[PDB]
Write a protein that binds this ligand. Structure first.
Ligand SMILES: *[C@@H]1O[C@H](CO)[C@@H](O)[C@H](O)[C@H]1NC(C)=O
Lengths: 48, 105, 53, 53, 49, 269, 53
Protein backbone atom coordinates (compact mmCIF):
# COMPACT_ATOMS: atom_id res chain seq x y z
CA UNK A 1 0.00 0.00 0.00
CA UNK A 2 1.17 3.48 -0.82
CA UNK A 3 3.93 2.13 -3.04
CA UNK A 4 4.35 1.66 -6.78
CA UNK A 5 2.25 -1.37 -7.69
CA UNK A 6 -0.66 -1.10 -5.23
CA UNK A 7 -3.00 -2.01 -8.11
CA UNK A 8 -1.85 -4.52 -10.74
CA UNK A 9 -3.65 -5.94 -13.76
CA UNK A 10 -2.28 -8.33 -16.35
CA UNK A 11 -3.43 -6.51 -19.51
CA UNK A 12 -5.04 -3.14 -20.33
CA UNK A 13 -8.43 -4.87 -20.72
CA UNK A 14 -8.15 -7.61 -18.06
CA UNK A 15 -11.45 -7.68 -16.22
CA UNK A 16 -9.93 -9.13 -13.04
CA UNK A 17 -7.37 -7.14 -11.06
CA UNK A 18 -5.21 -7.37 -7.92
CA UNK A 19 -5.34 -4.56 -5.39
CA UNK A 20 -3.70 -3.76 -2.05
CA UNK A 21 -4.75 -0.21 -1.23
CA UNK A 22 -5.40 -0.44 2.57
CA UNK A 23 -9.07 0.65 2.83
CA UNK A 24 -9.95 1.28 6.48
CA UNK A 25 -13.38 2.70 7.29
CA UNK A 26 -13.92 5.01 10.25
CA UNK A 27 -17.07 5.69 12.25
CA UNK A 28 -19.17 8.54 10.79
CA UNK A 29 -19.68 11.83 12.61
CA UNK A 30 -22.76 12.73 14.66
CA UNK A 31 -25.89 13.45 12.61
CA UNK A 32 -24.29 13.61 9.17
CA UNK A 33 -25.05 11.09 6.44
CA UNK A 34 -21.71 10.30 4.75
CA UNK A 35 -19.16 7.50 4.45
CA UNK A 36 -15.82 8.68 5.87
CA UNK A 37 -12.86 6.55 4.92
CA UNK A 38 -9.12 6.46 5.35
CA UNK A 39 -7.03 5.64 2.33
CA UNK A 40 -3.43 5.47 1.28
CA UNK A 41 -3.10 7.92 -1.65
CA UNK A 42 -2.34 6.72 -5.17
CA UNK A 43 1.12 5.26 -5.48
CA UNK A 44 1.14 6.07 -9.18
CA UNK A 45 -0.02 9.69 -8.84
CA UNK A 46 2.46 10.57 -6.14
CA UNK A 47 5.22 8.38 -7.61
CA UNK A 48 5.31 10.55 -10.74
CA UNK B 1 -8.87 24.90 -2.04
CA UNK B 2 -11.79 24.80 -4.43
CA UNK B 3 -15.12 26.66 -4.50
CA UNK B 4 -18.22 26.60 -6.70
CA UNK B 5 -20.78 29.39 -6.50
CA UNK B 6 -23.97 30.48 -8.20
CA UNK B 7 -26.85 32.88 -7.62
CA UNK B 8 -30.49 31.81 -7.50
CA UNK B 9 -33.43 33.31 -9.37
CA UNK B 10 -34.37 34.64 -5.93
CA UNK B 11 -30.97 36.41 -6.16
CA UNK B 12 -29.24 34.55 -3.33
CA UNK B 13 -25.61 33.59 -3.90
CA UNK B 14 -24.36 30.22 -2.67
CA UNK B 15 -20.73 29.09 -2.44
CA UNK B 16 -19.80 25.50 -1.60
CA UNK B 17 -16.08 25.02 -1.02
CA UNK B 18 -13.92 21.97 -0.44
CA UNK B 19 -10.38 21.45 0.78
CA UNK B 20 -8.52 20.08 -2.20
CA UNK B 21 -4.81 20.45 -2.88
CA UNK B 22 -4.77 21.39 -6.53
CA UNK B 23 -1.20 21.21 -7.72
CA UNK B 24 -0.33 21.27 -11.42
CA UNK B 25 1.82 18.37 -12.61
CA UNK B 26 5.06 19.44 -14.21
CA UNK B 27 5.49 18.83 -17.94
CA UNK B 28 8.96 18.80 -19.43
CA UNK B 29 11.75 20.30 -17.39
CA UNK B 30 10.68 23.90 -16.76
CA UNK B 31 8.31 24.90 -13.97
CA UNK B 32 6.71 27.53 -16.18
CA UNK B 33 3.45 29.46 -15.78
CA UNK B 34 1.70 30.02 -19.13
CA UNK B 35 2.64 28.50 -22.47
CA UNK B 36 4.44 30.96 -24.77
CA UNK B 37 4.12 31.74 -28.46
CA UNK B 38 7.39 29.86 -29.11
CA UNK B 39 7.32 26.38 -27.64
CA UNK B 40 8.60 22.86 -28.01
CA UNK B 41 5.93 20.25 -28.62
CA UNK B 42 5.50 17.59 -25.93
CA UNK B 43 2.67 15.05 -25.70
CA UNK B 44 0.32 15.31 -22.75
CA UNK B 45 -3.19 14.38 -21.64
CA UNK B 46 -6.26 16.63 -21.57
CA UNK B 47 -10.04 16.42 -21.56
CA UNK B 48 -12.12 16.53 -24.73
CA UNK B 49 -15.70 17.77 -25.03
CA UNK B 50 -17.33 14.61 -26.39
CA UNK B 51 -20.92 14.38 -25.21
CA UNK B 52 -22.03 10.82 -26.05
CA UNK B 53 -19.30 8.96 -24.16
CA UNK B 54 -18.86 5.21 -23.83
CA UNK B 55 -18.05 3.12 -20.73
CA UNK B 56 -17.92 5.58 -17.86
CA UNK B 57 -21.09 4.82 -15.98
CA UNK B 58 -23.11 5.86 -12.93
CA UNK B 59 -25.99 3.92 -11.37
CA UNK B 60 -29.31 5.81 -11.49
CA UNK B 61 -32.06 4.35 -9.26
CA UNK B 62 -34.71 5.51 -6.74
CA UNK B 63 -34.40 8.26 -4.10
CA UNK B 64 -34.70 7.69 -0.35
CA UNK B 65 -37.42 9.42 1.64
CA UNK B 66 -37.80 13.20 2.12
CA UNK B 67 -38.51 13.95 5.82
CA UNK B 68 -39.96 17.29 6.87
CA UNK B 69 -41.64 18.66 9.99
CA UNK B 70 -42.86 22.02 8.61
CA UNK B 71 -45.96 20.42 7.06
CA UNK B 72 -47.68 19.78 10.41
CA UNK B 73 -49.85 22.35 12.19
CA UNK B 74 -52.06 22.20 15.27
CA UNK B 75 -55.71 22.04 14.26
CA UNK B 76 -56.85 22.57 17.87
CA UNK B 77 -54.85 19.74 19.37
CA UNK B 78 -54.67 17.77 16.12
CA UNK B 79 -52.05 17.02 13.48
CA UNK B 80 -52.93 18.47 10.10
CA UNK B 81 -50.87 16.80 7.39
CA UNK B 82 -50.35 19.17 4.49
CA UNK B 83 -48.75 17.27 1.62
CA UNK B 84 -48.56 19.90 -1.17
CA UNK B 85 -49.54 17.37 -3.83
CA UNK B 86 -47.29 14.39 -3.11
CA UNK B 87 -47.09 11.21 -1.01
CA UNK B 88 -46.10 11.38 2.66
CA UNK B 89 -45.76 8.74 5.38
CA UNK B 90 -46.63 9.69 8.95
CA UNK B 91 -45.61 8.01 12.18
CA UNK B 92 -46.30 8.43 15.89
CA UNK B 93 -47.36 6.56 19.01
CA UNK B 94 -50.72 8.06 20.05
CA UNK B 95 -54.34 7.11 19.50
CA UNK B 96 -55.77 6.55 16.06
CA UNK B 97 -53.76 5.43 13.07
CA UNK B 98 -50.36 5.84 14.70
CA UNK B 99 -48.60 5.01 11.42
CA UNK B 100 -49.53 5.14 7.76
CA UNK B 101 -48.90 6.86 4.44
CA UNK B 102 -51.42 9.43 3.19
CA UNK B 103 -51.57 11.34 -0.09
CA UNK B 104 -53.68 14.40 0.76
CA UNK B 105 -54.82 16.20 3.94
CA UNK C 1 -13.86 21.54 13.60
CA UNK C 2 -10.35 20.58 12.56
CA UNK C 3 -9.21 17.83 10.18
CA UNK C 4 -8.11 14.39 11.16
CA UNK C 5 -5.35 12.81 9.12
CA UNK C 6 -4.79 9.71 7.05
CA UNK C 7 -3.60 6.79 9.14
CA UNK C 8 -0.18 5.84 7.87
CA UNK C 9 1.30 2.54 6.82
CA UNK C 10 3.66 0.64 9.07
CA UNK C 11 6.35 -1.92 8.37
CA UNK C 12 7.94 -3.78 11.21
CA UNK C 13 11.24 -5.27 12.22
CA UNK C 14 13.35 -6.76 14.98
CA UNK C 15 13.40 -4.12 17.71
CA UNK C 16 12.43 -1.33 15.29
CA UNK C 17 9.63 0.16 13.24
CA UNK C 18 9.52 1.95 9.90
CA UNK C 19 6.55 4.23 9.41
CA UNK C 20 5.63 5.30 5.88
CA UNK C 21 3.59 8.48 6.15
CA UNK C 22 1.26 10.35 3.80
CA UNK C 23 0.46 14.04 4.33
CA UNK C 24 -1.71 16.38 2.36
CA UNK C 25 -0.89 19.73 3.99
CA UNK C 26 1.95 20.68 6.43
CA UNK C 27 1.45 18.40 9.41
CA UNK C 28 3.30 17.61 12.60
CA UNK C 29 4.86 14.44 13.94
CA UNK C 30 6.25 13.72 17.37
CA UNK C 31 7.85 10.78 19.08
CA UNK C 32 9.10 9.96 22.56
CA UNK C 33 9.91 7.16 24.97
CA UNK C 34 8.18 6.32 28.26
CA UNK C 35 11.15 5.93 30.58
CA UNK C 36 13.23 8.21 32.76
CA UNK C 37 14.06 10.35 29.78
CA UNK C 38 11.48 11.40 27.20
CA UNK C 39 14.19 11.60 24.49
CA UNK C 40 11.80 13.91 22.71
CA UNK C 41 11.80 14.76 19.02
CA UNK C 42 9.30 16.32 16.66
CA UNK C 43 9.14 17.30 13.03
CA UNK C 44 7.12 19.20 10.48
CA UNK C 45 6.41 17.13 7.38
CA UNK C 46 4.97 18.06 3.99
CA UNK C 47 5.71 15.21 1.54
CA UNK C 48 5.30 11.45 1.41
CA UNK C 49 8.23 10.52 3.64
CA UNK C 50 9.07 7.31 5.46
CA UNK C 51 10.90 7.34 8.79
CA UNK C 52 12.68 4.77 10.93
CA UNK C 53 12.26 4.52 14.69
CA UNK D 1 -30.68 14.76 -29.72
CA UNK D 2 -28.63 13.84 -26.63
CA UNK D 3 -31.73 13.35 -24.49
CA UNK D 4 -29.95 11.16 -21.97
CA UNK D 5 -31.57 12.95 -18.99
CA UNK D 6 -35.11 11.61 -19.09
CA UNK D 7 -35.08 10.59 -15.39
CA UNK D 8 -33.16 13.39 -13.70
CA UNK D 9 -33.48 16.00 -10.95
CA UNK D 10 -31.19 18.10 -8.78
CA UNK D 11 -29.93 16.04 -5.89
CA UNK D 12 -29.31 18.53 -3.03
CA UNK D 13 -26.64 17.62 -0.53
CA UNK D 14 -24.69 18.71 2.54
CA UNK D 15 -21.55 20.81 1.91
CA UNK D 16 -19.00 21.35 4.69
CA UNK D 17 -19.00 25.11 4.06
CA UNK D 18 -21.82 27.22 2.61
CA UNK D 19 -19.63 30.20 3.26
CA UNK D 20 -19.40 31.81 6.73
CA UNK D 21 -17.28 28.98 8.11
CA UNK D 22 -19.93 26.50 9.14
CA UNK D 23 -21.51 23.81 6.99
CA UNK D 24 -24.84 23.93 5.17
CA UNK D 25 -27.17 21.98 2.90
CA UNK D 26 -26.31 23.30 -0.55
CA UNK D 27 -27.49 22.59 -4.09
CA UNK D 28 -23.88 22.66 -5.29
CA UNK D 29 -22.24 20.22 -2.88
CA UNK D 30 -19.62 18.77 -5.21
CA UNK D 31 -19.37 15.02 -4.76
CA UNK D 32 -16.41 13.95 -6.89
CA UNK D 33 -13.38 15.63 -8.40
CA UNK D 34 -10.95 14.03 -10.82
CA UNK D 35 -7.74 15.60 -12.09
CA UNK D 36 -5.85 12.79 -13.85
CA UNK D 37 -5.61 14.80 -17.08
CA UNK D 38 -2.03 16.08 -16.94
CA UNK D 39 -2.99 19.46 -18.46
CA UNK D 40 -4.52 20.74 -15.25
CA UNK D 41 -8.16 20.43 -16.30
CA UNK D 42 -10.24 19.84 -13.20
CA UNK D 43 -13.32 17.68 -13.81
CA UNK D 44 -15.96 18.24 -11.12
CA UNK D 45 -19.10 16.22 -10.42
CA UNK D 46 -21.60 18.80 -9.15
CA UNK D 47 -24.82 17.77 -7.38
CA UNK D 48 -27.15 19.75 -9.65
CA UNK D 49 -27.50 19.66 -13.42
CA UNK D 50 -27.33 22.23 -16.21
CA UNK D 51 -28.74 22.80 -19.68
CA UNK D 52 -31.96 20.83 -19.38
CA UNK D 53 -34.81 23.10 -18.34
CA UNK E 1 -4.89 4.89 -11.09
CA UNK E 2 -7.42 3.25 -8.80
CA UNK E 3 -11.02 4.37 -8.23
CA UNK E 4 -12.71 4.04 -4.83
CA UNK E 5 -16.30 3.01 -5.58
CA UNK E 6 -18.36 3.86 -2.49
CA UNK E 7 -22.11 3.37 -2.96
CA UNK E 8 -24.81 4.98 -0.86
CA UNK E 9 -24.67 3.88 2.81
CA UNK E 10 -27.41 1.53 3.96
CA UNK E 11 -29.11 3.27 6.88
CA UNK E 12 -31.32 0.71 8.58
CA UNK E 13 -33.69 2.72 10.79
CA UNK E 14 -34.93 0.93 13.93
CA UNK E 15 -32.98 -2.19 12.93
CA UNK E 16 -29.57 -3.83 12.66
CA UNK E 17 -27.98 -4.16 9.22
CA UNK E 18 -26.03 -7.25 8.14
CA UNK E 19 -22.88 -7.34 5.99
CA UNK E 20 -22.77 -9.74 3.03
CA UNK E 21 -19.42 -11.38 2.26
CA UNK E 22 -18.56 -10.62 -1.37
CA UNK E 23 -15.48 -11.36 -3.47
CA UNK E 24 -14.19 -7.88 -4.32
CA UNK E 25 -10.70 -6.36 -3.94
CA UNK E 26 -10.32 -4.56 -0.58
CA UNK E 27 -14.01 -5.17 0.14
CA UNK E 28 -14.89 -3.36 3.35
CA UNK E 29 -18.09 -3.49 5.42
CA UNK E 30 -18.89 -2.13 8.87
CA UNK E 31 -22.12 -1.78 10.85
CA UNK E 32 -22.18 1.31 13.08
CA UNK E 33 -24.80 1.35 15.85
CA UNK E 34 -26.53 4.36 17.35
CA UNK E 35 -26.65 6.57 14.27
CA UNK E 36 -29.00 9.56 14.20
CA UNK E 37 -28.84 11.00 10.68
CA UNK E 38 -30.19 14.43 9.78
CA UNK E 39 -31.98 15.52 6.61
CA UNK E 40 -33.89 18.78 5.84
CA UNK E 41 -36.67 18.04 8.31
CA UNK E 42 -34.94 16.44 11.25
CA UNK E 43 -33.98 12.85 11.87
CA UNK E 44 -34.37 10.51 8.92
CA UNK E 45 -35.03 7.61 11.30
CA UNK E 46 -37.94 7.63 13.73
CA UNK E 47 -36.03 5.78 16.45
CA UNK E 48 -33.42 7.64 18.49
CA UNK E 49 -30.81 4.96 19.23
CA UNK F 1 -40.52 31.66 35.70
CA UNK F 2 -40.41 28.30 33.88
CA UNK F 3 -43.44 26.47 32.50
CA UNK F 4 -43.92 22.91 33.69
CA UNK F 5 -43.99 20.26 30.98
CA UNK F 6 -44.95 17.12 32.84
CA UNK F 7 -44.55 16.05 36.45
CA UNK F 8 -43.90 12.55 37.70
CA UNK F 9 -42.74 10.62 40.74
CA UNK F 10 -40.33 7.77 40.03
CA UNK F 11 -39.75 4.90 42.48
CA UNK F 12 -37.14 2.25 41.62
CA UNK F 13 -35.20 -0.33 43.62
CA UNK F 14 -31.79 0.13 45.22
CA UNK F 15 -28.95 -1.58 43.39
CA UNK F 16 -30.55 -0.96 39.99
CA UNK F 17 -29.67 1.72 37.42
CA UNK F 18 -31.84 4.84 37.21
CA UNK F 19 -33.08 6.30 33.93
CA UNK F 20 -34.46 9.82 34.39
CA UNK F 21 -36.44 10.54 31.25
CA UNK F 22 -36.29 14.04 29.73
CA UNK F 23 -37.30 14.19 26.08
CA UNK F 24 -38.27 17.04 23.76
CA UNK F 25 -38.49 17.22 19.95
CA UNK F 26 -38.36 21.04 20.20
CA UNK F 27 -34.83 20.99 21.65
CA UNK F 28 -33.24 19.17 18.71
CA UNK F 29 -30.16 20.97 17.35
CA UNK F 30 -26.72 20.06 16.02
CA UNK F 31 -23.24 21.60 16.38
CA UNK F 32 -23.56 23.35 13.01
CA UNK F 33 -25.42 26.62 12.29
CA UNK F 34 -26.92 25.16 9.10
CA UNK F 35 -29.55 27.76 8.07
CA UNK F 36 -30.59 28.49 11.65
CA UNK F 37 -31.85 31.98 10.79
CA UNK F 38 -34.41 30.62 8.31
CA UNK F 39 -38.03 31.73 8.31
CA UNK F 40 -40.65 31.30 5.61
CA UNK F 41 -43.76 33.22 4.68
CA UNK F 42 -46.44 31.56 2.64
CA UNK F 43 -49.94 32.52 1.57
CA UNK F 44 -52.47 29.77 0.95
CA UNK F 45 -55.82 29.93 -0.83
CA UNK F 46 -58.83 27.83 0.11
CA UNK F 47 -62.48 27.80 -0.89
CA UNK F 48 -64.44 26.26 1.95
CA UNK F 49 -64.29 22.84 3.61
CA UNK F 50 -64.94 20.83 0.44
CA UNK F 51 -62.11 22.04 -1.79
CA UNK F 52 -58.40 21.30 -1.81
CA UNK F 53 -55.97 24.00 -0.67
CA UNK F 54 -53.26 25.27 -3.01
CA UNK F 55 -50.00 26.91 -1.99
CA UNK F 56 -49.85 30.22 -3.82
CA UNK F 57 -46.58 31.94 -2.78
CA UNK F 58 -43.70 31.32 -0.38
CA UNK F 59 -40.53 33.21 0.57
CA UNK F 60 -37.45 32.47 2.66
CA UNK F 61 -36.01 34.92 5.15
CA UNK F 62 -33.57 37.41 3.57
CA UNK F 63 -34.85 36.19 0.19
CA UNK F 64 -37.32 36.97 -2.57
CA UNK F 65 -40.88 35.74 -3.03
CA UNK F 66 -41.66 32.78 -5.29
CA UNK F 67 -44.88 32.73 -7.33
CA UNK F 68 -46.35 29.49 -8.69
CA UNK F 69 -48.68 30.92 -11.37
CA UNK F 70 -46.97 32.74 -14.28
CA UNK F 71 -49.96 35.06 -14.74
CA UNK F 72 -49.71 36.14 -11.08
CA UNK F 73 -46.00 37.02 -11.32
CA UNK F 74 -45.46 40.79 -10.77
CA UNK F 75 -49.11 40.90 -9.58
CA UNK F 76 -48.94 39.27 -6.16
CA UNK F 77 -46.29 41.14 -4.19
CA UNK F 78 -44.83 41.12 -0.72
CA UNK F 79 -42.47 43.76 0.55
CA UNK F 80 -38.95 42.39 -0.12
CA UNK F 81 -37.92 43.76 3.31
CA UNK F 82 -40.95 42.24 5.07
CA UNK F 83 -38.75 40.54 7.69
CA UNK F 84 -37.21 43.78 8.98
CA UNK F 85 -40.32 45.26 10.63
CA UNK F 86 -42.64 42.25 10.52
CA UNK F 87 -44.85 43.80 7.83
CA UNK F 88 -45.83 40.65 5.95
CA UNK F 89 -48.84 42.30 4.29
CA UNK F 90 -49.64 41.19 0.75
CA UNK F 91 -50.40 43.71 -1.99
CA UNK F 92 -52.30 42.25 -4.92
CA UNK F 93 -52.24 44.75 -7.81
CA UNK F 94 -55.62 43.88 -9.36
CA UNK F 95 -58.30 41.49 -8.15
CA UNK F 96 -60.65 39.37 -10.26
CA UNK F 97 -63.63 37.06 -9.72
CA UNK F 98 -61.44 33.93 -9.65
CA UNK F 99 -59.57 35.24 -6.60
CA UNK F 100 -62.54 34.84 -4.22
CA UNK F 101 -61.91 32.63 -1.21
CA UNK F 102 -60.08 32.51 2.11
CA UNK F 103 -56.39 33.49 2.08
CA UNK F 104 -54.21 32.42 5.01
CA UNK F 105 -50.96 34.16 6.00
CA UNK F 106 -48.51 31.61 7.44
CA UNK F 107 -45.26 32.49 9.21
CA UNK F 108 -42.92 29.63 10.08
CA UNK F 109 -39.60 29.55 11.92
CA UNK F 110 -37.66 26.39 11.15
CA UNK F 111 -35.41 26.54 14.18
CA UNK F 112 -38.09 26.86 16.85
CA UNK F 113 -40.40 24.95 14.44
CA UNK F 114 -43.11 27.51 15.06
CA UNK F 115 -46.00 28.22 12.74
CA UNK F 116 -48.56 30.98 13.08
CA UNK F 117 -51.36 31.77 10.70
CA UNK F 118 -54.37 33.99 10.29
CA UNK F 119 -57.10 33.95 7.68
CA UNK F 120 -58.82 36.72 5.72
CA UNK F 121 -61.66 36.00 3.31
CA UNK F 122 -61.51 37.96 0.07
CA UNK F 123 -64.75 38.57 -1.81
CA UNK F 124 -64.71 40.52 -5.10
CA UNK F 125 -67.74 42.63 -5.93
CA UNK F 126 -68.63 44.86 -8.87
CA UNK F 127 -69.91 47.88 -6.90
CA UNK F 128 -67.31 49.85 -4.90
CA UNK F 129 -69.81 51.01 -2.25
CA UNK F 130 -70.25 47.45 -0.95
CA UNK F 131 -66.50 47.23 -0.22
CA UNK F 132 -65.74 46.98 3.51
CA UNK F 133 -63.27 45.37 5.92
CA UNK F 134 -64.61 43.73 9.06
CA UNK F 135 -63.76 41.23 11.79
CA UNK F 136 -66.28 38.39 11.95
CA UNK F 137 -65.16 37.31 15.43
CA UNK F 138 -62.26 35.05 14.46
CA UNK F 139 -60.94 36.28 11.10
CA UNK F 140 -60.83 39.37 8.92
CA UNK F 141 -63.11 39.50 5.88
CA UNK F 142 -62.17 41.89 3.05
CA UNK F 143 -64.76 42.94 0.46
CA UNK F 144 -62.93 44.44 -2.54
CA UNK F 145 -64.12 46.10 -5.73
CA UNK F 146 -63.05 44.38 -8.96
CA UNK F 147 -59.66 45.47 -10.33
CA UNK F 148 -58.64 47.45 -7.25
CA UNK F 149 -55.50 46.53 -5.28
CA UNK F 150 -55.82 44.75 -1.95
CA UNK F 151 -53.40 45.17 0.95
CA UNK F 152 -54.02 42.17 3.22
CA UNK F 153 -52.28 43.07 6.46
CA UNK F 154 -50.29 40.38 8.27
CA UNK F 155 -48.19 42.03 10.98
CA UNK F 156 -46.41 40.07 13.72
CA UNK F 157 -43.71 42.19 15.34
CA UNK F 158 -42.55 39.48 17.75
CA UNK F 159 -38.78 39.45 18.23
CA UNK F 160 -38.43 36.01 16.63
CA UNK F 161 -39.86 37.28 13.32
CA UNK F 162 -38.14 40.67 12.97
CA UNK F 163 -34.65 41.19 11.51
CA UNK F 164 -32.41 41.54 14.57
CA UNK F 165 -29.40 39.58 15.90
CA UNK F 166 -31.49 36.34 15.81
CA UNK F 167 -28.68 34.08 16.92
CA UNK F 168 -29.24 31.88 19.93
CA UNK F 169 -25.75 30.66 20.97
CA UNK F 170 -26.66 29.78 24.57
CA UNK F 171 -29.65 27.38 25.00
CA UNK F 172 -28.87 25.41 28.14
CA UNK F 173 -30.37 22.36 29.81
CA UNK F 174 -29.96 22.14 33.57
CA UNK F 175 -30.18 19.06 35.74
CA UNK F 176 -30.93 20.06 39.34
CA UNK F 177 -31.29 18.08 42.53
CA UNK F 178 -33.26 19.06 45.62
CA UNK F 179 -32.17 16.84 48.47
CA UNK F 180 -34.71 15.38 50.93
CA UNK F 181 -35.52 17.96 53.57
CA UNK F 182 -33.29 20.53 51.78
CA UNK F 183 -35.33 23.42 50.37
CA UNK F 184 -35.09 24.68 46.78
CA UNK F 185 -32.94 27.53 45.30
CA UNK F 186 -29.91 26.38 47.34
CA UNK F 187 -30.03 23.15 45.35
CA UNK F 188 -26.78 21.61 44.20
CA UNK F 189 -26.06 22.04 40.52
CA UNK F 190 -25.77 18.57 39.02
CA UNK F 191 -25.40 18.97 35.29
CA UNK F 192 -25.12 21.78 32.79
CA UNK F 193 -25.65 20.92 29.13
CA UNK F 194 -24.76 23.72 26.75
CA UNK F 195 -26.00 23.85 23.15
CA UNK F 196 -22.36 23.63 22.01
CA UNK F 197 -22.16 20.15 23.59
CA UNK F 198 -20.17 20.95 26.74
CA UNK F 199 -21.35 19.58 30.07
CA UNK F 200 -20.41 20.82 33.52
CA UNK F 201 -20.62 18.52 36.55
CA UNK F 202 -20.05 19.63 40.16
CA UNK F 203 -19.31 17.79 43.37
CA UNK F 204 -17.02 15.13 44.87
CA UNK F 205 -15.92 12.08 42.80
CA UNK F 206 -18.52 9.85 44.48
CA UNK F 207 -21.24 11.90 42.74
CA UNK F 208 -19.53 12.69 39.39
CA UNK F 209 -18.75 9.03 38.58
CA UNK F 210 -22.43 8.08 38.36
CA UNK F 211 -24.08 10.96 36.46
CA UNK F 212 -24.05 10.98 32.66
CA UNK F 213 -26.20 11.87 29.66
CA UNK F 214 -25.75 10.31 26.22
CA UNK F 215 -23.39 12.30 24.03
CA UNK F 216 -26.01 13.12 21.37
CA UNK F 217 -28.52 14.36 23.99
CA UNK F 218 -29.43 17.67 22.37
CA UNK F 219 -28.99 16.12 18.92
CA UNK F 220 -31.90 13.76 19.59
CA UNK F 221 -33.68 15.99 22.11
CA UNK F 222 -33.46 13.25 24.74
CA UNK F 223 -31.74 14.33 27.95
CA UNK F 224 -32.45 11.22 30.04
CA UNK F 225 -29.85 10.77 32.75
CA UNK F 226 -28.53 7.26 33.23
CA UNK F 227 -27.19 6.78 36.75
CA UNK F 228 -25.42 3.50 37.41
CA UNK F 229 -25.25 1.87 40.87
CA UNK F 230 -27.98 3.86 42.59
CA UNK F 231 -27.07 5.21 46.00
CA UNK F 232 -29.26 6.97 48.54
CA UNK F 233 -27.57 10.26 47.65
CA UNK F 234 -29.35 10.06 44.27
CA UNK F 235 -32.82 10.25 45.80
CA UNK F 236 -34.48 13.63 45.64
CA UNK F 237 -36.22 16.11 43.36
CA UNK F 238 -34.54 16.36 39.96
CA UNK F 239 -35.32 19.03 37.46
CA UNK F 240 -34.53 19.12 33.76
CA UNK F 241 -34.58 22.72 32.53
CA UNK F 242 -34.60 23.60 28.86
CA UNK F 243 -33.78 27.28 28.41
CA UNK F 244 -34.12 29.08 25.09
CA UNK F 245 -33.95 32.68 26.26
CA UNK F 246 -34.31 34.07 22.74
CA UNK F 247 -37.35 32.08 21.60
CA UNK F 248 -38.95 32.51 25.03
CA UNK F 249 -38.89 28.80 25.75
CA UNK F 250 -38.34 28.12 29.45
CA UNK F 251 -39.57 24.68 30.42
CA UNK F 252 -38.81 22.27 33.21
CA UNK F 253 -39.67 18.72 34.19
CA UNK F 254 -39.65 17.74 37.86
CA UNK F 255 -38.97 14.24 39.18
CA UNK F 256 -39.55 12.97 42.72
CA UNK F 257 -37.06 10.10 42.95
CA UNK F 258 -37.84 7.68 45.79
CA UNK F 259 -36.17 4.33 46.34
CA UNK F 260 -38.84 1.61 46.90
CA UNK F 261 -41.13 -0.57 44.75
CA UNK F 262 -38.95 -2.78 42.46
CA UNK F 263 -41.63 -4.17 40.12
CA UNK F 264 -44.78 -3.03 41.96
CA UNK F 265 -44.31 0.71 41.30
CA UNK F 266 -47.19 2.84 40.01
CA UNK F 267 -45.78 5.18 37.34
CA UNK F 268 -47.24 8.56 38.25
CA UNK F 269 -49.08 10.79 35.72
CA UNK G 1 -2.70 43.97 3.14
CA UNK G 2 -6.19 45.13 3.95
CA UNK G 3 -8.32 47.12 1.50
CA UNK G 4 -11.80 48.45 2.14
CA UNK G 5 -13.83 50.05 -0.60
CA UNK G 6 -17.22 51.31 -1.71
CA UNK G 7 -18.80 53.25 -4.55
CA UNK G 8 -20.24 56.72 -4.19
CA UNK G 9 -23.68 57.99 -5.00
CA UNK G 10 -21.84 60.00 -7.69
CA UNK G 11 -20.19 56.81 -9.05
CA UNK G 12 -16.76 57.29 -7.49
CA UNK G 13 -15.06 54.12 -6.24
CA UNK G 14 -13.36 55.06 -2.99
CA UNK G 15 -10.79 52.50 -1.84
CA UNK G 16 -8.70 52.87 1.31
CA UNK G 17 -5.87 50.48 2.08
CA UNK G 18 -3.72 49.68 5.09
CA UNK G 19 -0.80 47.38 5.84
CA UNK G 20 -1.89 44.49 8.02
CA UNK G 21 0.06 41.25 8.27
CA UNK G 22 -2.79 38.77 8.61
CA UNK G 23 -1.93 35.19 9.58
CA UNK G 24 -4.75 33.29 11.27
CA UNK G 25 -3.22 30.88 13.78
CA UNK G 26 -3.19 27.12 13.65
CA UNK G 27 -5.59 25.03 15.70
CA UNK G 28 -4.03 21.77 16.76
CA UNK G 29 -0.99 20.53 14.90
CA UNK G 30 -2.14 20.60 11.26
CA UNK G 31 -1.61 23.60 8.98
CA UNK G 32 -4.87 23.14 7.12
CA UNK G 33 -6.83 25.60 5.03
CA UNK G 34 -10.59 25.06 5.33
CA UNK G 35 -13.08 22.91 7.19
CA UNK G 36 -13.31 19.29 6.04
CA UNK G 37 -16.25 17.00 6.66
CA UNK G 38 -14.52 14.51 8.95
CA UNK G 39 -12.55 16.07 11.77
CA UNK G 40 -12.03 16.52 15.49
CA UNK G 41 -13.50 19.35 17.58
CA UNK G 42 -11.18 21.86 19.25
CA UNK G 43 -12.04 25.07 21.09
CA UNK G 44 -11.29 28.35 19.38
CA UNK G 45 -12.47 31.95 19.68
CA UNK G 46 -14.85 33.66 17.26
CA UNK G 47 -17.04 36.72 17.14
CA UNK G 48 -20.83 37.02 17.08
CA UNK G 49 -23.34 39.05 15.07
CA UNK G 50 -24.80 40.81 18.10
CA UNK G 51 -25.16 44.53 18.69
CA UNK G 52 -26.42 44.65 22.29
CA UNK G 53 -22.95 44.68 23.81
C1 LIG H 1 -46.43 47.58 4.96
O1 LIG H 1 -45.81 47.78 3.68
C2 LIG H 1 -46.63 48.45 2.71
C3 LIG H 1 -45.83 48.51 1.43
O2 LIG H 1 -45.37 47.22 1.04
C4 LIG H 1 -47.03 49.83 3.23
O3 LIG H 1 -47.90 50.46 2.29
C5 LIG H 1 -47.71 49.70 4.58
O4 LIG H 1 -47.99 51.00 5.09
C6 LIG H 1 -46.84 48.93 5.56
N1 LIG H 1 -47.52 48.76 6.83
C7 LIG H 1 -47.43 49.65 7.83
C8 LIG H 1 -48.20 49.32 9.07
O5 LIG H 1 -46.77 50.67 7.73
Amino acid sequence: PGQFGDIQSRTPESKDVYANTQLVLQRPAAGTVHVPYSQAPSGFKYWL
Amino acid sequence: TLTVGFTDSRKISHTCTHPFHHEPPVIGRERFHSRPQHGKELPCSTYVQSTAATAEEIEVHMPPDTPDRTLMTQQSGNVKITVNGQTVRYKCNCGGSNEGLTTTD
Amino acid sequence: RVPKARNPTVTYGKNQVTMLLYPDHPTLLSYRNMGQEPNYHEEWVTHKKEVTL
Amino acid sequence: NFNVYKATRPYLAHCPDCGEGHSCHSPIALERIRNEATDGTLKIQVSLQIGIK
Amino acid sequence: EYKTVIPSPYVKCCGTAECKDKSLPDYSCKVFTGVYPFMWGGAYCFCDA
Amino acid sequence: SSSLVSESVVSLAAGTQAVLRCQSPRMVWTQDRLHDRQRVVHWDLSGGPGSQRRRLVDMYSAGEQRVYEPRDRDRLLLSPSAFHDGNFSLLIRAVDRGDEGVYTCNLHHHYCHLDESLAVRLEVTEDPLLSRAYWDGEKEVLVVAHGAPALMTCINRAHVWTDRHLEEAQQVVHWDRQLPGVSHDRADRLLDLYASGERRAYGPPFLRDRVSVNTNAFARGDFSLRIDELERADEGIYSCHLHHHYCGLHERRVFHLQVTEPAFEPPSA
